[PDB]
């Protein structure tokens, strides 16, 4: 007559996340007038038409 119980438990967790985003854009316009030329950078047709 003797009783013994023993338990050991271990849990481990590791989690790693990484995100990276990079953008580059370059636009150039020649001719017309420079003020309307800047308008094409909107990408909007009416402003492209105005240039």
């Amino acid at each position: 007559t003797g009783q013994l119980s023993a338990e050991a438990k271990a849990k481990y967790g590791e989690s790693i996340s990484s995100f990276t985003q990079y953008s580059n854009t370059h636009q150039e316009v020649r001719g017309g007038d420079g003020a309307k030329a800047h308008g094409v950078f909107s990408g909007k047709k009416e402003d492209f038409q105005a240039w």
Partner: protein, 51 residues
């Protein structure tokens, strides 16, 4: 334990160009200079380097 990091950067450049002015460097250009500037130039005592 938790560690969470963000970095963000933006650079933008915009440029507009309009008309350039040029000056022909002809010898007669001296006659167009302002008279007080002209006499200030040719009264310069170049015998003194500090002047």
């Amino acid at each position: 334990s938790l560690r969470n990091a963000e970095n963000e950067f933006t650079r933008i450049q915009q440029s507009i160009n309009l008309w350039s002015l040029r000056l022909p460097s002809v010898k007669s250009l001296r006659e167009l200079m302002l008279p007080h500037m002209r006499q200030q130039l040719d009264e310069l005592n170049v015998n003194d380097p500090k002047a």
